[PDB]
CSV table of C-alpha atoms and ligand atoms in Angstrom, one decimal:
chain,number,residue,atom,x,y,z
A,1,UNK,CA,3.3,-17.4,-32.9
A,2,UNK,CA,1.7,-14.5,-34.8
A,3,UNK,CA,2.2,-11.2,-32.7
A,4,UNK,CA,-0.8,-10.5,-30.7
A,5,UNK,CA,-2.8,-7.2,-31.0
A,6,UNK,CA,-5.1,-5.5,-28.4
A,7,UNK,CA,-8.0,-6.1,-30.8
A,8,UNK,CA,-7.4,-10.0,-30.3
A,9,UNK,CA,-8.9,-9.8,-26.7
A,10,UNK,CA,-11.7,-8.7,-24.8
A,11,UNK,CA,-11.1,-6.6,-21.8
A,12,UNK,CA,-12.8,-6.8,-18.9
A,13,UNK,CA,-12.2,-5.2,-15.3
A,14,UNK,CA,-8.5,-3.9,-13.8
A,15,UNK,CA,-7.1,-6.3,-11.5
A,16,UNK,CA,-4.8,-3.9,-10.0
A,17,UNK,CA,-3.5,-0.1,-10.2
A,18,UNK,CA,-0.1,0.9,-9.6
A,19,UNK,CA,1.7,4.7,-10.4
A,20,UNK,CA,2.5,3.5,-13.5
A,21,UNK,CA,1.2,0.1,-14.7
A,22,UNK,CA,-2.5,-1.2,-15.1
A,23,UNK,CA,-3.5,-4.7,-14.8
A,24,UNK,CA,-6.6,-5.6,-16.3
A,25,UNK,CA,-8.2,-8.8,-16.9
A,26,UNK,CA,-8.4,-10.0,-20.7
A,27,UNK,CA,-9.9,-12.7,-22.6
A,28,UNK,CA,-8.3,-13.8,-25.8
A,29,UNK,CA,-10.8,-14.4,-28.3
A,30,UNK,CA,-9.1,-16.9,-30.2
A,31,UNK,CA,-8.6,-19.5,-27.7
A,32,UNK,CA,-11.0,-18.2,-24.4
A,33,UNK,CA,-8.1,-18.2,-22.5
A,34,UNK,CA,-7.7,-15.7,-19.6
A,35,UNK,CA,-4.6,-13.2,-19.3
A,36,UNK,CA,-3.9,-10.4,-16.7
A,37,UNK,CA,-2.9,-8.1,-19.2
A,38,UNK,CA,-0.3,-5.5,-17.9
A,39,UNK,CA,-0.4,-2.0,-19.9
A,40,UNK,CA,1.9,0.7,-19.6
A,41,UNK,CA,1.8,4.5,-21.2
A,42,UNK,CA,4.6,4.9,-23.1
A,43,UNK,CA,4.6,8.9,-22.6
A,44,UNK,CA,3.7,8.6,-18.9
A,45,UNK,CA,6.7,5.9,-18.6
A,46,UNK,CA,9.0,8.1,-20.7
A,47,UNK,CA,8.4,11.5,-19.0
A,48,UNK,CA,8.7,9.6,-15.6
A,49,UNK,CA,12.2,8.3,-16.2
A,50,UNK,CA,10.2,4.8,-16.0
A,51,UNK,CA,11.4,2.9,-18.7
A,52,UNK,CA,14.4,1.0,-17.4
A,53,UNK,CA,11.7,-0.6,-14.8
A,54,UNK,CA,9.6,-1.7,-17.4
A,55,UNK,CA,12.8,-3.2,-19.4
A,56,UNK,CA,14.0,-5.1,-16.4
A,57,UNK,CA,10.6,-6.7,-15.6
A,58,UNK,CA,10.5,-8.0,-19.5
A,59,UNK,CA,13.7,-9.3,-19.0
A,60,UNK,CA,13.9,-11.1,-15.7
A,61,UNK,CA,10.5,-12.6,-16.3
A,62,UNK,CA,11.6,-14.2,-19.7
A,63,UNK,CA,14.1,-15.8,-17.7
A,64,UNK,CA,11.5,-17.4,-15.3
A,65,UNK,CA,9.9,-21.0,-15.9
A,66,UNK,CA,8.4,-22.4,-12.7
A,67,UNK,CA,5.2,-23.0,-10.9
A,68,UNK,CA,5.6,-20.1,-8.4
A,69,UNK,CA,6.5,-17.7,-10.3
A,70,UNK,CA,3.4,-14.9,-12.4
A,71,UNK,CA,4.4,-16.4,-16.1
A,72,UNK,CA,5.4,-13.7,-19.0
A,73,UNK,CA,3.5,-15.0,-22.2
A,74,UNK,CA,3.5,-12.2,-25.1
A,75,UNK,CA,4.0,-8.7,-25.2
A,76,UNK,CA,3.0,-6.8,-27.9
A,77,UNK,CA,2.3,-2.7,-28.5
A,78,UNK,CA,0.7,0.1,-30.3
A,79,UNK,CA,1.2,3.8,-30.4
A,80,UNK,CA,0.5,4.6,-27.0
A,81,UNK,CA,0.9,1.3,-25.1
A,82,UNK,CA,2.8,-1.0,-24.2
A,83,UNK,CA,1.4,-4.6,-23.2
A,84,UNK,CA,2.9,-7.7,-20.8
A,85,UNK,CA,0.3,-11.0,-21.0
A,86,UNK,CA,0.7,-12.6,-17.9
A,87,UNK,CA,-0.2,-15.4,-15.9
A,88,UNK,CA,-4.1,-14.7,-14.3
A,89,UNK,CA,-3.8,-15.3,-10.2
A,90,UNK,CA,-7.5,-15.4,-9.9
A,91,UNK,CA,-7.6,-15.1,-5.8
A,92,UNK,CA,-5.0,-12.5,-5.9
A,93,UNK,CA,-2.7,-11.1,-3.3
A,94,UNK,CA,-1.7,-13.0,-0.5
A,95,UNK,CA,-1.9,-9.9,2.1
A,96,UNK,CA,-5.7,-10.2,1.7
A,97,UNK,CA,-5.9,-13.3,3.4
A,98,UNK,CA,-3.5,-12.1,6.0
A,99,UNK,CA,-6.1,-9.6,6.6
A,100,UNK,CA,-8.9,-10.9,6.6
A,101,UNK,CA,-8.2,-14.6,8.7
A,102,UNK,CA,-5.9,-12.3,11.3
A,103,UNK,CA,-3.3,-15.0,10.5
A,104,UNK,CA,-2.5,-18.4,9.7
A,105,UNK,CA,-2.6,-21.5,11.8
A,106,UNK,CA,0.3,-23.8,12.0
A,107,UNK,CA,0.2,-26.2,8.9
A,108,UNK,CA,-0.7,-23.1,6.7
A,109,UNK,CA,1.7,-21.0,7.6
A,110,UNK,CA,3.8,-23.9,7.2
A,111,UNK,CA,2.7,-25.3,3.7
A,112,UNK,CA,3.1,-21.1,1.8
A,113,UNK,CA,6.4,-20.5,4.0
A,114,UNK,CA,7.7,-23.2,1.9
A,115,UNK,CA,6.4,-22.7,-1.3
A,116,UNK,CA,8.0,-19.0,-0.7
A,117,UNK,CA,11.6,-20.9,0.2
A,118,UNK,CA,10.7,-23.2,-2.9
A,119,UNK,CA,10.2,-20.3,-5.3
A,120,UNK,CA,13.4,-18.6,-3.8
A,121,UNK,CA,15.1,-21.5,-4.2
A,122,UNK,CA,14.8,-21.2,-7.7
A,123,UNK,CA,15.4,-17.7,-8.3
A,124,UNK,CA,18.8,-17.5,-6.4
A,125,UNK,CA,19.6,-20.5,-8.2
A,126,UNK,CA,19.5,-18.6,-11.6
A,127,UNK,CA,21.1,-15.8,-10.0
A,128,UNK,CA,18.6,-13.1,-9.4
A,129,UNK,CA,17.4,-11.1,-6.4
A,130,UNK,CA,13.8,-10.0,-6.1
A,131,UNK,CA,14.1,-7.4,-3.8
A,132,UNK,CA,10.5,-6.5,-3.2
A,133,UNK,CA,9.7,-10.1,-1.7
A,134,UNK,CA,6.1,-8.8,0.3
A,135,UNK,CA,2.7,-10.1,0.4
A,136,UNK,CA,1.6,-8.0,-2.0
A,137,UNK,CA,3.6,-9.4,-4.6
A,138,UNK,CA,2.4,-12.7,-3.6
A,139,UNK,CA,-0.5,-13.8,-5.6
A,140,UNK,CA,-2.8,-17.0,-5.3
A,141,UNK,CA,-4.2,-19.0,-8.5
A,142,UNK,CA,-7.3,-20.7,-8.3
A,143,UNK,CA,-5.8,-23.6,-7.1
A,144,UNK,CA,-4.8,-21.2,-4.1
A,145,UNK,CA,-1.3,-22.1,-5.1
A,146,UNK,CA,1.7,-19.0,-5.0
A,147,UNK,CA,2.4,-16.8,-8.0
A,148,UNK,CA,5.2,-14.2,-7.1
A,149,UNK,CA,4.8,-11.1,-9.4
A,150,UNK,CA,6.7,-7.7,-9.3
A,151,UNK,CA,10.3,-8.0,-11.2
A,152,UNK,CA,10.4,-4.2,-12.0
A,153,UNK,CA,12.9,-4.1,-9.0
A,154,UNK,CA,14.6,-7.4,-9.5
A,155,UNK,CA,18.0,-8.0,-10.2
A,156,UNK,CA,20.1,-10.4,-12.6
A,157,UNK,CA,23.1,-11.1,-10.7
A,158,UNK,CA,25.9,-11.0,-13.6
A,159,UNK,CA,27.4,-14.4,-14.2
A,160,UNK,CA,30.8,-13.4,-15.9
A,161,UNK,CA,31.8,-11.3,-12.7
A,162,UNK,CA,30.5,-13.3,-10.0
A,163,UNK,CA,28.4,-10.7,-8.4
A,164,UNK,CA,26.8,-10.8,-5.5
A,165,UNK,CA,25.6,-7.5,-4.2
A,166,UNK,CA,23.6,-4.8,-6.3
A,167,UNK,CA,23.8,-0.7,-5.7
A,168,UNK,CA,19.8,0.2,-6.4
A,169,UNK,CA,17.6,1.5,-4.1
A,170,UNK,CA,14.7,0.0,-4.5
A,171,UNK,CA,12.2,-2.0,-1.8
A,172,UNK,CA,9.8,-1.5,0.6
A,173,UNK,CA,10.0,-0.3,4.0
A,174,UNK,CA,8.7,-2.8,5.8
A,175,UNK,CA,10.7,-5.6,4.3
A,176,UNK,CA,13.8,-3.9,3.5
A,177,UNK,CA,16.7,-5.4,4.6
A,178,UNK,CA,19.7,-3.4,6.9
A,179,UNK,CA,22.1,-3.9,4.3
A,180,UNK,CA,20.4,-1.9,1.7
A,181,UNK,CA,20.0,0.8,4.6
A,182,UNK,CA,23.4,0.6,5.6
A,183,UNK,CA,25.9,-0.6,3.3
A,184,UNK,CA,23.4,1.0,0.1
A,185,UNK,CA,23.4,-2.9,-1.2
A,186,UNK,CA,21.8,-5.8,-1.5
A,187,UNK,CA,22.3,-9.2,-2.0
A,188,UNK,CA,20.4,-12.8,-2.6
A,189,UNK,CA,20.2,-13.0,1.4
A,190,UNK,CA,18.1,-9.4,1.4
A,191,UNK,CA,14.8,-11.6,0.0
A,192,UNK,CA,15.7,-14.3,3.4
A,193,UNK,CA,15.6,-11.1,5.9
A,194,UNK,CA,11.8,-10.3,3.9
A,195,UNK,CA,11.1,-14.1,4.0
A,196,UNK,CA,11.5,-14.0,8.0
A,197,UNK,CA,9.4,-10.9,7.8
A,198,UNK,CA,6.6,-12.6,5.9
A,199,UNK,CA,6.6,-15.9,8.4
A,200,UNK,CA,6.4,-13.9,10.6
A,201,UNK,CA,3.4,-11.6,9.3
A,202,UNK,CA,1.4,-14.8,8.8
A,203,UNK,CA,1.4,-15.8,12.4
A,204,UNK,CA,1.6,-12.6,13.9
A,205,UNK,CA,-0.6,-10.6,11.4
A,206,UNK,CA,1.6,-7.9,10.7
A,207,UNK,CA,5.1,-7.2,9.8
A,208,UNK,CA,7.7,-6.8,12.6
A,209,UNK,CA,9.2,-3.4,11.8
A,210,UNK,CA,6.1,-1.3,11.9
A,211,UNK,CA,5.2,2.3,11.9
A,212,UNK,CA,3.8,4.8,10.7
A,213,UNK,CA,6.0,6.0,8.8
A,214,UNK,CA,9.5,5.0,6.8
A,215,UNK,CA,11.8,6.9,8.7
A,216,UNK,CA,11.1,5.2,12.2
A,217,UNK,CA,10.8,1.8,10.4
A,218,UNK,CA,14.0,2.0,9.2
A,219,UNK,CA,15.6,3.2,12.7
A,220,UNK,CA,13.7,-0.2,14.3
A,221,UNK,CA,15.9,-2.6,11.1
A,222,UNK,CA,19.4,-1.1,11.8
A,223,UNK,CA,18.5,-1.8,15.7
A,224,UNK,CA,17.1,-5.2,15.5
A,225,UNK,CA,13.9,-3.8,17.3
A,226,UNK,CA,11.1,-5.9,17.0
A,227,UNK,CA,9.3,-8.9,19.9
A,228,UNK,CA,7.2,-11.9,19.2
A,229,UNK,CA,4.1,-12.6,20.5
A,230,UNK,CA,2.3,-15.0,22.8
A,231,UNK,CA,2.0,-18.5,21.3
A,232,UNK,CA,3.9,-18.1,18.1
A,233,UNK,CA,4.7,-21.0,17.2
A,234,UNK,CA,7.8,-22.1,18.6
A,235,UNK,CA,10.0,-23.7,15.6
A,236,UNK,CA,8.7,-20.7,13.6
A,237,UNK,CA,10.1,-18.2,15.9
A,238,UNK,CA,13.5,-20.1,16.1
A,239,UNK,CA,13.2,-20.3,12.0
A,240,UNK,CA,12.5,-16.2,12.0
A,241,UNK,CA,15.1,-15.8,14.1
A,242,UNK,CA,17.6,-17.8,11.8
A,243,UNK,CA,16.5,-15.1,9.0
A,244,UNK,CA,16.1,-11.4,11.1
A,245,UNK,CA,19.7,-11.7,11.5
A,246,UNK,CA,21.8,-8.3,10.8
A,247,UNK,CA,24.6,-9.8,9.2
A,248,UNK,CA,23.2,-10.7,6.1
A,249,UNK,CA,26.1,-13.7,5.6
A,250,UNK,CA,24.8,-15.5,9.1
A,251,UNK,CA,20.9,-16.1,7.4
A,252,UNK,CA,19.3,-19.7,7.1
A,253,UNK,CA,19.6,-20.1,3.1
A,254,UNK,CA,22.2,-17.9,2.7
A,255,UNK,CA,25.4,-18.6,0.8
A,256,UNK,CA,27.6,-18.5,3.1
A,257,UNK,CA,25.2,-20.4,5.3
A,258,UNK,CA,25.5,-23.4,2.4
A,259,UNK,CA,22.5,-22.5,0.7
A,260,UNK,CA,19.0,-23.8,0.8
A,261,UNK,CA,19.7,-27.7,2.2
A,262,UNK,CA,19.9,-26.3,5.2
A,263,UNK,CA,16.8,-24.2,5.3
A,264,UNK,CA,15.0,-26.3,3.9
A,265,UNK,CA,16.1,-28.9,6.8
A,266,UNK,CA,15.2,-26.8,9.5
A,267,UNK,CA,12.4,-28.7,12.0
A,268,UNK,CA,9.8,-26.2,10.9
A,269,UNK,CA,9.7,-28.5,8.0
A,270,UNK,CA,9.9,-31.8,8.9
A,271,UNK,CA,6.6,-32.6,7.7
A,272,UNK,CA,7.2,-30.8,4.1
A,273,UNK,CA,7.6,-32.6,1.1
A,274,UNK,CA,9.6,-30.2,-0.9
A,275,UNK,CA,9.9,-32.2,-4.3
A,276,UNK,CA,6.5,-31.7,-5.5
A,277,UNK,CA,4.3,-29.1,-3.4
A,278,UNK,CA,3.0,-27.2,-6.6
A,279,UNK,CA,0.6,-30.4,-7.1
A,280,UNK,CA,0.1,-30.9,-3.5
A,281,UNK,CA,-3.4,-29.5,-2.5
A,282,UNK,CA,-3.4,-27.1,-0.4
A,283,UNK,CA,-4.4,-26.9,3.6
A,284,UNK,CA,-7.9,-24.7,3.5
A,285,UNK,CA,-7.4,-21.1,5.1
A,286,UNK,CA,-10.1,-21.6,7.3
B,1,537,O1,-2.5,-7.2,-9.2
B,1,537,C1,-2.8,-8.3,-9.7
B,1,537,C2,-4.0,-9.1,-9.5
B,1,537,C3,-4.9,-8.7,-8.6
B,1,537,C4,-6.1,-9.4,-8.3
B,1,537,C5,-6.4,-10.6,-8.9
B,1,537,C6,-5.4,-11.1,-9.9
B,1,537,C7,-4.3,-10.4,-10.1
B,1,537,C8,-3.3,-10.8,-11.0
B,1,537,N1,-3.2,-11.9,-11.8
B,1,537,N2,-2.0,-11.9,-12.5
B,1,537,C9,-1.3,-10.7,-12.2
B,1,537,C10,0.0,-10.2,-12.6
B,1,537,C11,0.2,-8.9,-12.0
B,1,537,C12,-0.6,-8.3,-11.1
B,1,537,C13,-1.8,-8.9,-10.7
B,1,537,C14,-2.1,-10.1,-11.3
């Protein structure tokens, strides 16, 4: 299709702020379809050494085709701008409900852990790592469906060499995984160790490496350091503990674990039917 302009939509009010990307809601005039819009300052990206980020989210996402994953649809730019039409998630993050319900009952927590394994499941499958897998990447569409967002930090796994492990630094501290800590790499099983930490967060209501700031977080990963509380739900806790595993080739899903059947099989699931849960409806919050 013709290249779009920024004079073929109607802006409206910023979704979300980050150091150095703005998301702001956009109607296209043409069609009255909605975008988030994604805009970028070429000098602030250039003079902030910025611009790889902003070439590896452009390419991992035009890699992407599937329900749970924030859909790249045009990008177009003008002298001071460049701009990435995405999917809209209308509810938005993920952590917001966390927040606000305190956490999840059983069958949600349930239904969203495995459209996360789902979505993961797919990724891995074309070879790329996420790396920043949080609730804050985690959006909800109107349907209250998951839209995972954020591929600044991702990784394409090279093909031709059979990689498996990746030498940036990149995360956050409360879902980074030991290897990156330790070993300064990651690897597909890095996004199963933040997995466990987001099942967990949902029932819990926060994270289980916590403080207040980086440095001791990262001294509780290396150690293992972290307890469950009263009535978490049992076949969740043996699932997080098949995930918050050090050795990152001993983690449900993982590779050398045989992959996702097995994950997918574990009795936290029984009930799930894993061939079509993007047109399932989803359980009600509250
Ligand atoms: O931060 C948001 C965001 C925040 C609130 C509501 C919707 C969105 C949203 N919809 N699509 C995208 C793509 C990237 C980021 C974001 C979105």
């Amino acid at each position: 299709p013709r290249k779009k302009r920024p004079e073929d939509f109607k802006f409206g009010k910023i979704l979300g702020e980050g150091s150095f990307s703005t998301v702001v809601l956009a109607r296209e005039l043409a069609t009255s379809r909605e975008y988030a819009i994604k805009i970028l300052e070429k000098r602030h990206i250039i003079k902030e050494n910025k611009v790889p980020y902003v070439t590896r989210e452009r390419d991992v996402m035009s890699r992407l085709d599937h329900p749970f994953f924030v859909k790249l649809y045009f990008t177009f730019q003008d002298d001071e701008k460049l701009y990435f039409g995405l999917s809209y998630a209308k509810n938005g993050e993920l952590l917001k409900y966390i927040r606000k319900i305190g956490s999840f009952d059983e069958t949600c927590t349930r239904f969203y852990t495995a459209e996360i394994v789902s979505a993961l499941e797919y990724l891995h499958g074309k070879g790329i790592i996420h790396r920043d897998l949080k609730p804050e990447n985690i959006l909800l569409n109107e349907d209250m469906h998951i839209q995972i967002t954020d591929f600044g930090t991702a990784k394409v796994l090279s093909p031709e060499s059979k990689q498996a492990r990746a030498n940036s630094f990149v995360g956050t501290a409360q879902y980074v995984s030991p290897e990156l800590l330790t070993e300064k790499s990651a690897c597909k099983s890095s996004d199963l160790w933040a997995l466990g930490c987001i099942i967990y967060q949902l029932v819990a209501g926060l994270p289980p490496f916590r403080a207040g700031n980086e440095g001791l977080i990262f001294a509780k990963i290396i150690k293992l350091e972290y307890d469950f509380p009263e009535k978490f739900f049992p076949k969740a806790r043996d699932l997080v503990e098949k995930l918050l595993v050090l050795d990152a080739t001993k983690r449900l899903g993982c590779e050398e674990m045989e992959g996702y059947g097995p994950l997918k099989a574990h009795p936290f699931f029984e009930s799930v039917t894993w061939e079509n849960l993007h047109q399932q409806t989803p359980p009600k919050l509250t």
